[PDB]
Design a protein around this ligand. Structure first.
Ligand SMILES: O=C(O)COc1ccc(F)cc1
Ligand SMILES: O=C(O)COc1ccc(F)cc1
Lengths: 263, 265
């Protein structure tokens, strides 16, 4: 793709592939999650990167604290979907990355996503409050005035997610990441947690409904040799409360909510 | 992409994506396997298919992969453009064969090649049958009439007999289950998943010091969504060779068998 005229956002067109679609002949939420990740890497690369030299000398990385995705229409196999992405500062809390999905032919907004990222030491794993020198190097690539994919007053991207109480209504136990679930740094990518969360949704709901919204809170990183339990309870359109936790000790790694519409 | 000038093969260029590369910053064998599958689907679509013919749909017949063989010389890096050319051929009444050539779009050098053998089967009864004369004429108008082989060699490793891994296996990955992302548009476990499952029993040490040069996979039975697989490996060998076996966790029913060849980095 390419940066837009002002250089304050990035655009890319993707053609949906045969292996990227589900039983309805449209792209899966995991293909969409992969495309958002891909368009965000190319934006970081096109502006010289998403770690800066200040963060490299300090062993600092950006970790996803929260992801929220709303899809109105899923692209079909062979369709061209255009994605626009941009970053923003959230004071000393961290950074935010937003996405808008469109039909390349009609120009209609077919989806949108927002994610909150926090600073962390690659080694000690502790969340740092973002300094001042780090703002003076990534604000020259962010829009100065606020630009939100979910601007709405009191929207569902900033909702407090409760913890799923036992017993869960539904569950998928013994989930292990394989080598294909790890990225170039050998860490389990954030798209795998989405797939793991959806594994505990009954095949009946999947066959009769379409996923409209998903909000995912990341608490702990899952390692390659870890085993995950996926838990779901209907809270309702169909709404679900979700929880990913380690098979052994029951250590919480993720919590979220999904919203499904009838087909 | 597009069909070549003669309409007897299809070409497509792919840019390698960030989530498609491994720890070495180059495409995984599963990304390559996905790209071959994708370029084969667009070739079938470009010549009027949906890869079943009108006689095949009339009789509930499908093409199933009996064998896959892939040899990679150089793996494309993240951001590289890899061009893939594919074509089909009739193998008498046995079935069909699909071949692939992988190239660097910039230098034009062959960086890999693959071959697969497909057999005819009833979708419902799962009974493999010989290709009839009517089906053969419907797909011979889209195939090169003279032989065109990605592995023409008189002693190639794509027609090798694979033995069955004897117990105890040297290495193993137990309790592998396919998720919804492992199933295709027809709800069947995608062929690429078996490749990932076969490689799960290779020690992380071999993966970190070697690169996969060759893989040959024999498909015996289809794995269902609610099935559980056991992946088994034994070293048979600068080059490291392995014998592989996928089997059902329960009864020990064979679903796959294969061999891999790895070279030092
Ligand atoms: O690796 C760990 O243990 C910490 O993971 C986190 C992930 C996301 C967070 F917002 C905070 C922490
Ligand atoms: O579903 C079954 O039991 C049969 O699966 C096969 C798969 C690949 C083959 F080459 C032959 C058979």
């Amino acid at each position: 793709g390419s940066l837009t005229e002002d250089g304050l956002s990035y655009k890319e067109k993707f053609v949906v592939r045969s292996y990227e679609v589900g039983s309805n002949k449209t792209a899966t939420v995991e293909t969409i999650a992969n495309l958002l990740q891909e368009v965000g890497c190319n934006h970081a690369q096109s502006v010289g990167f998403a770690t800066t030299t200040t963060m490299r000398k300090l062993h600092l990385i950006w970790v996803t604290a929260r992801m929220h995705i709303e899809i109105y229409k899923y692209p079909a196999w062979g369709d061209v979907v255009e994605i626009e992405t941009w970053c923003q500062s959230e004071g000393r809390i961290g950074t935010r990355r937003d996405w808008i999905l469109k039909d390349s032919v009609t120009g209609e907004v077919t989806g949108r996503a927002t994610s909150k990222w926090v600073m962390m030491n690659q080694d000690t794993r502790r969340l740092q409050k973002v300094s001042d020198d780090v703002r003076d190097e990534y604000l020259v690539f962010c829009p100065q005035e606020p630009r939100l994919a979910f601007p709405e007053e009191n929207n569902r991207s900033l909702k407090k997610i409760p913890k799923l109480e036992d017993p869960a209504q539904y569950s998928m136990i013994g989930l292990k990441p394989r080598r294909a679930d790890l990225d170039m740094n050998q860490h389990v990518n954030n798209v795998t947690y989405i797939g793991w969360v959806l594994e505990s949704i009954p095949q009946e709901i999947v066959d009769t409904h379409e996923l409209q919204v998903i909000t995912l809170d990341y608490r702990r990183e899952c390692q390659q040799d870890d085993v995950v339990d996926s838990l779901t309870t209907t809270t309702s359109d169909s709404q679900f409360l979700h929880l990913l936790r380690l098979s052994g000790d029951g250590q919480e790694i993720n919590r979220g909510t999904t919203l499904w519409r009838k087909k």
